[PDB]
Design a protein around this ligand. Structure first.
Ligand code: ADP
Ligand code: ADP
Ligand code: ICS
Ligand code: CLF
Ligand code: SF4
Ligand code: ALF
Ligand code: ALF
Ligand code: FE
Ligand code: MG
Ligand code: MG
Lengths: 478, 522, 274, 274
């Protein structure tokens, strides 16, 4: 658990690699040291993955279609390219929404151009135009269209921008071309950036000359919340009870109309800094809308964030925030009193994507658990700077960890619980360690606010204290 | 608010009054949603014949397809070999998606690697990526064989798998003797089953083509079994059990049964039992080769007939009664082993179950979809059972397969109301089940949404889904079921009859309204 | 100001050398001209930089990791007469994808300013074999507005010009790009002037200039520099200055009208013999 | 026999016409030859077929859906001397991806026989800009075993030949394909023969022949026919006959030895002036 032991473990794990792979991978494993916020602490991120090492990262298409654009309900998102890309991405994420699917909401559906050989050889711009015409014919109540590119689209130089412009002018529809080819970037982060750029270029400035919207001194926009299991609703009920008027949600149970109405708000409450800081900064520079980060994981973080948000408004909002915190205090007090004795002192290792490896630490600490290791898939150095103040001393930090690295680290540290994605769940359940899916909340949730903290504590207790983990070893063996 | 004693997850938490009011206020204030009357009108329109004709006039847009890309099937084929690592040459997002798909279907670890080709590799080629990835994979995960597939990005730019692997071996990145079979699997050609075919042909050609001089047909007194793209472990299990019970020497090539059903005993085995390299090398010496799924094993059949000089029998998938009988009879003819009494008793028990459940099964109307061979066998079994497969859909089918299924349907009186669709997706099937309503629909988990749609038109228009096929995501441990042989026929029969009985029990549960038919004995 | 031209034509017809000599003449006229090579062969800016510049966009993006870590000053250089030269990188023949490299280079140049300057002219020297949409990138909406085709009396050259006009048709209908004219670099064909004039009339465009085949151009290219720098008093230098003046004063921008195969066969059966 | 050769070179250097005339010379010699045009423009088999071949593999596959539904007869045509001619399809310039089309066409030819016949020579005429692996497809394992590069005295042709050798190296290392020799097409440069022979020596290869630049080829091509067919008594017909004889009798097949930019520059400075 000491620094020297963790460093020796790092070297032992890296020993198996070839020289080039070892030299690269040494820079992505580190031992946490607070009061040190930079990339000097032998941790670098946002780099190319080493080939043939079973990485967990996705593509820019996943970061654009699957993350930023897909949860938008009244919009048809077309996976332009071969089949498969959109089939694996179909309904795999739990961005919850309200609507009549197939007539006015299209989050679950899968629209694609289904490229063949002739589409590759002769191009697919005419096919894209015909596809847009058919989409308009068969789904009248769609409020917009987005065209998410895949790898061959970017290779063969298809002009989706011209088609989008012409068809939008012809049908008076908003068509957003996203050049989220999978080979672009090194992970989903470039997909986040490209999606934010497309939002800025094609959707954000639509209502610039419109002043019919009624502004209020209490206008806020929720940024970077994708409503995984209902998280955005759980946050929104708190924010609306404490006095604000949440105009927009970016981009979970969210519509194109509230995306266009975001430039009218007074404050931008950013949850996922990694995926949406670009559009937050753009709105700050253009419309002069301040943006502040907030955390709604666990009672401590949500109380602190609520007070910080209320500090930005008049004293009435702060008074209402005090009332809402007082009202919700006994519920989470009961939850901690029920579940903390069962989970006190348990050690957790996490490996999630760009924001959650550091945001969920407060909720785990509120339950008496210690996070003895964390890592990111696609986070940049600002994410690690934020993380280093939240994570314990002499604790493992990993960037774009490999399957072998994660397996060896878990074998040596021997945690009580691991929070990662679907591609490691059964690996670590085989080894006998309780596993919690921290992407989709293991098909449960929400985990935001106090209403989400109750479910979070219940799920952690359910998985950690299940009797199945006591039966891994057959009685006739030792 | 949450009661500590009774904690509510998203359902039914978001049915609370405060959440309902907040959601209504948000929708009314900032969503600019169409009025509910307009939405209802549009939905009712979508469930009509005019909408069906507009939907079937589609030529460029695909909505809710039922198929995947070739590298998924290539990975599944590569997983069936002993200590073999699937290696997709291309971009990493593809491999992440493949692993997530197979993890969600099998609830098992799925090992596959990528060389993580990027913009730089897209422009300059991925030969350096190939060398580095092969060396890293062999050093780290220590496989006995690396099977290389391709991503659409590498297929577009024309990356030469053979040249890249040869340069990797000649520059010392991997041993010259290490087996690295490869296959070109373009995602814009065919589907996942085509990728399985391509990968198996590549492995067979890697291990057999050069060493054809010393091979004699029938030397090892075995029958090669090529199972194709299979996602039911019970299918491999039943094929092996039937062949072993019959006393037949067999060589099941690309067996992934062990690696997809690893025991949980506190130890993680990345590799489990599969087809050995010795089996693959000795395969030409077998008496013959039987293809379990002949409608997506065309390239493999061509290679086996042209190189190994095996006369591959013209057998259908051993699904149902008649086709299992033909499969067993052909195996007996090829190997000379008589069919044992155990298989005769199993066939008799299947016939007995058919006889017992015929009254409930007869006349039922089914929509269904899946892969070509699976769909063909399911239609054959349904015709044997006396059911009516009204809507037969196969996205990855062709004209020859459609002709074969049409000939099968025309041979039975129960195929009069059946139409076969190729190149149609699940939006087409949603229109069909709205217009020509069947009793049930048999398919993967993606049909659940279709069922939901029907329930929105009314409880009397709902078409229940029976989950048989791939992928099955919303149910647990259904991949252990059997589909092939008499055992699979019994399992499918039980599932169908009990689904019918469950629906009938649900429809007659209303006391004083319809409970006069809530019969204890059925 | 801020004119934008692309140079297309049959492979090996002399697009690169003619473009470089035109650019040198324009710079001699005191104009500020930029040149972008859209060829995987990084040979479009040699005669201005007096060297095969190794600072191509794609290989330096490789050295810097991603394209997002690339800076304009790193790959942009100045040459003879203050001409700015940028080269799009490319793979070795028979590997990779050059169209993607051209797409990436053009997108990088657009994102990081580059053309957001006071430059009068921006030239896009494109390769002979336009085989994908990547090599038509200079012909997109906010890119080169006028296209010049370099051709010669050979019928494969005119078939290439016809095919390139067929390609230009789609990007002209969807944009504001137009065919300025046809440049003729003579290959000592028998009836070259009449043949190229007839082809231009059939396509609806005009003969902008005629460039005689002079070995002074090859001699200059051996010395890594243009005819203007090699021999300011040569007749070929005068012809290049006349061509530069013509393109400066050109005003006929017409959507191409491609002809069929049989029409071309008749064109050179009547205008190519005797 | 069944010798498979691939014709590469700089764009517009004359690979297509030289290949067609060579194939016709072989046809007069009693050899069974088949040409395959790996170019988006179907201009590589016009001379043998006396017309543009409209039955290209990729276009007919697009018309009939998938290339699997195609058949060899619908695309394989015979011409002068019984020379079978096959052409790969391709999109109009500036759209699609021609390399993928070439890959698909070659795979279709390989599956449906074509090569497996009594042909003595199988030629693959490739375009001048090999921008991707699709146009290196004829250089794969069981494809063209000899590569002939068409060069000229102009420096750009020399640099293109060096670049093409650089690209060839990665396929020659991993396979049995070898650079048979350089073919020189005259373009009236000063020291043509000296430059070509020096570049061949530096590359480690040989000059197969020196084809003179004569106007008869323009007249023969205008008539949509080969020079040997147009004027068997002409001097250029004798030169093409000698080129055919030397190609048939070539036994030198080596892995190319590419030279860097500085070596080519110094070679050209020494051998290209005066
Ligand atoms: N007007 C001309 N006079 C003499 N030689 C020329 C002329 N134009 C081109 N050339 C020769 O032809 C070759 C053309 O090469 P290049 O400009 O790269 O062709 P492209 O760029 O059109 O493929 C050059 O090497 C040059 O020596
Ligand atoms: N030896 C030669 N002498 C004179 N002209 C030639 C010669 N070889 C080819 N040509 C001319 O080149 C034109 C065809 O060029 P093409 O074959 O398309 O070039 P490449 O195949 O080298 O790219 C013909 O019109 C012909 O007149
Ligand atoms: S968007 Fe990002 S990988 Fe910020 S791509 Fe990923 S629904 Fe993760 S850690 Mo899946 S940067 Fe969201 C994420 Fe975090 S899909 Fe979800 S859980 S908070
Ligand atoms: S990195 Fe990302 S998911 Fe991969 S392809 Fe590229 S955009 Fe898509 Fe697509 S059809 Fe299948 S899954 Fe690929 S091999 Fe192509
Ligand atoms: S034809 Fe163009 S888009 Fe296709 S692989 Fe070659 S360079 Fe890339
Ligand atoms: F041969 Al080039 F641009 F150098 F067409
Ligand atoms: F033979 Al070409 F451009 F037609 F080099
Ligand atoms: Fe399991
Ligand atoms: Mg050039
Ligand atoms: Mg040619």
């Amino acid at each position: 658990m000491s620094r020297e032991e963790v460093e020796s473990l790092i070297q032992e794990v890296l020993e198996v690699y070839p020289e080039k792979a070892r030299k690269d991978r040494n820079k992505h494993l580190a031992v946490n040291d607070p009061a040190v916020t930079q990339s000097k602490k032998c941790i670098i991120s946002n780099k190319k993955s080493q080939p043939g090492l079973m990485t967990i990262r996705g593509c820019a298409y996943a970061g654009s279609k699957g993350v930023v654009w897909g949860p938008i309900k009244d919009m048809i998102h077309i996976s332009h390219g071969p089949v498969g890309c959109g089939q694996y991405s179909r309904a795999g994420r739990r961005n919850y929404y309200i609507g009549t699917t197939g007539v006015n909401a299209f989050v679950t559906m899968n629209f694609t151009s289904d490229f063949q050989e002739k589409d590759i050889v002769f191009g697919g711009d005419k096919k894209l135009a015909k596809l847009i015409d058919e989409v308009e014919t068969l789904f009248p109540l769609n409020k917009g269209i987005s065209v998410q590119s895949e790898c061959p689209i970017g290779l063969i130089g298809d002009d989706i921008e011209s088609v989008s412009k012409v068809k939008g002018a012809e049908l008076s529809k908003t068509i957003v071309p996203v050049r989220c080819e999978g080979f672009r970037g090194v992970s989903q982060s470039l997909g986040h950036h490209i999606a934010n750029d497309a939002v800025r270029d094609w959707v954000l400035g639509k209502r610039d000359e419109d002043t019919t919207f009624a502004s209020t001194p209490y206008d806020v926009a929720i940024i970077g919340d994708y409503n995984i299991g209902g998280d955005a609703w759980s946050s929104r009920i708190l924010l609306e009870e404490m006095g604000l008027r949440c105009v927009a949600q970016w981009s979970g149970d969210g519509s194109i109309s509230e995306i266009e109405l975001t430039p009218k708000v007074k404050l931008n409450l950013v949850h996922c800094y990694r995926s949406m800081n670009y559009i937050s900064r753009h709105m700050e520079e253009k419309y002069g809308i301040p943006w502040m980060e907030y955390n709604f994981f666990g009672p401590t973080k949500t109380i602190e964030s609520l007070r910080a948000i209320a500090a930005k408004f008049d004293e009435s909002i702060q008074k209402k925030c005090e009332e809402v915190i007082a009202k919700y205090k006994p519920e989470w007090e009961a939850v901690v009193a029920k579940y903390r004795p069962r989970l006190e002192g348990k050690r957790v290792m996490l490996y999630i994507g760009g924001l959650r490896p550091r945001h969920v630490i407060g909720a785990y600490e509120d339950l008496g658990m210690e996070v003895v290791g964390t890592g990111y898939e696609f986070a940049h150095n600002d994410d690690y700077d934020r993380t280093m103040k939240e994570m314990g001393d002499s604790t493992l930090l990993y960037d774009d960890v490999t399957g072998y690295e994660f397996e060896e680290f878990v074998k040596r540290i021997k945690p009580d619980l691991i929070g990662s994605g679907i591609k490691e769940k059964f690996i670590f359940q085989k080894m006998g360690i309780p596993f919690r899916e921290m992407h989709s909340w293991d098909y449960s949730g929400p985990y935001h606010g106090f209403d989400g903290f109750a479910i979070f504590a219940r799920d952690m207790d359910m998985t950690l204290n299940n009797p199945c983990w006591k039966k891994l070893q057959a009685p006739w063996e030792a | 608010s949450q009661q500590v004693d009774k904690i509510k997850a998203s359902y039914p938490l978001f049915l609370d009054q405060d959440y309902k009011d907040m959601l209504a206020k948000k929708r009314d204030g900032f969503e600019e949603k169409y009025p509910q009357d307009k939405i209802d009108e549009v939905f009712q329109w979508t469930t009509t014949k005019e909408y069906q004709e507009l939907n079937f006039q589609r030529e460029a847009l695909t909505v809710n397809p039922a198929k995947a890309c070739q590298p998924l099937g290539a990975v599944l084929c590569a997983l069936g070999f002993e200590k073999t690592m699937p290696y997709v040459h291309g971009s990493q997002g593809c491999v992440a998606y493949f692993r997530s798909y197979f993890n969600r279907h099998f609830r098992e670890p799925v090992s596959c690697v990528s060389d993580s080709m990027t913009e730089d590799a897209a422009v300059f080629g991925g030969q350096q990526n190939m060398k580095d990835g092969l060396q890293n994979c062999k050093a780290t995960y220590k496989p006995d064989m690396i099977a290389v597939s391709t991503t659409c990005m590498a297929e577009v730019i024309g990356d030469d798998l053979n040249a890249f692997i040869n340069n990797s071996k000649k520059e010392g990145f991997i041993p010259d003797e290490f087996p690295v079979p490869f296959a070109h699997t373009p995602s814009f050609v065919g589907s996942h089953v085509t990728g399985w075919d391509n990968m198996f042909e590549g492995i067979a050609r890697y291990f057999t083509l050069k060493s054809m001089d010393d091979k004699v047909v029938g030397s090892n007194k075995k029958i090669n079994i090529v199972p194709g793209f299979e996602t039911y472990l019970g299918n491999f299990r039943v094929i092996k059990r039937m062949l072993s019970e019959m006393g037949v020497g067999y060589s099941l090539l690309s067996d992934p049964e062990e690696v997809l059903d690893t025991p949980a005993d506190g130890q993680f085995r990345m590799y489990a039992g599969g087809t050995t390299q010795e089996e693959m090398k000795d395969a030409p010496n077998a008496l013959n080769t039987v293809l379990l799924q002949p409608w997506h094993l065309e390239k493999t059949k061509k290679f086996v007939e042209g190189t190994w000089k095996h006369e591959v029998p013209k057998l259908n998938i051993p699904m149902g009664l008649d086709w299992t009988d033909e499969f067993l009879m052909k195996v007996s003819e090829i190997s000379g082993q008589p069919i044992p009494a155990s298989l005769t008793k199993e066939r008799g028990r299947l016939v007995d179950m058919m006889t017992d459940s015929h009254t409930w099964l007869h006349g039922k109307r089914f929509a269904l979809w899946g892969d070509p061979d699976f769909v063909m066998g399911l239609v054959k079994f349904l015709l044997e059972l006396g059911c009516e497969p009204v809507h037969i859909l196969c996205h990855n089918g062709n004209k020859r397969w459609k002709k074969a299924v049409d000939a099968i349907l025309a041979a039975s009186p129960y195929g009069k109301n059946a139409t076969v669709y190729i190149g149609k997706d699940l939006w087409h099937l949603r229109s069909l089940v709205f217009t020509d309503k069947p009793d049930f629909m048999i398919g993967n988990s993606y049909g659940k949404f279709i069922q939901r749609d029907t329930l929105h038109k009314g409880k009397e228009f709902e078409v229940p889904l029976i989950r048989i096929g791939f992928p099955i995501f919303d149910r647990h441990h259904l991949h252990r079921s059997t589909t092939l042989g008499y055992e699979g026929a019994m399992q499918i029969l039980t599932t169908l009859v009990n689904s019918i009985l469950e629906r009938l029990d649900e429809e007659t549960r209303g006391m004083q309204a319809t409970d006069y038919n809530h019969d204890l004995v059925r | 100001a801020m004119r934008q031209c692309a140079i297309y034509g049959k492979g090996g017809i002399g697009k690169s050398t003619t473009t470089q000599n035109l650019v040198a003449a324009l710079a001699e006229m005191g104009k500020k001209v930029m040149i972008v090579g859209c060829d995987p062969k990084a040979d479009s800016t040699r005669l201005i930089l007096h060297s095969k510049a190794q600072n191509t966009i794609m290989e330096m993006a490789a050295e810097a990791g991603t394209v997002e870590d690339l800076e304009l000053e790193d790959v942009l250089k100045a040459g003879y007469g203050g001409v700015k030269c940028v080269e799009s990188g490319g793979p070795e023949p028979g590997v990779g994808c050059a169209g993607r490299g051209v797409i990436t280079a053009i997108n990088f140049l657009e994102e990081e300013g580059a053309y957001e300057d006071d430059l009068d002219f921006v030239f896009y020297d494109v390769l002979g074999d336009v085989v994908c949409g990547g090599f038509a990138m200079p012909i997109r909406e906010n890119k080169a507005q006028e296209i010049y085709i370099v051709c010669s009396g050979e019928m494969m050259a005119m078939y290439a010009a016809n095919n390139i006009s067929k390609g230009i048709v789609k990007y002209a209908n969807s944009g504001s790009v137009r065919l300025g004219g046809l440049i003729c670099n003579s290959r000592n064909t028998d009836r070259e002037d009449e043949l190229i004039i007839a082809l231009a009339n059939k396509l609806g465009t005009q003969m902008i200039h005629f460039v005689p085949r002079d070995n002074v151009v090859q001699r200059a290219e051996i010395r890594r520099m243009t005819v203007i720098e090699y021999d300011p008093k040569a007749k070929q230098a005068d012809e290049y200055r006349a061509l530069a003046r013509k393109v400066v004063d050109n005003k006929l921008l017409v959507i191409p009208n491609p002809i069929t195969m049989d029409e071309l066969e008749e064109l050179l059966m009547e205008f190519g013999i005797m």
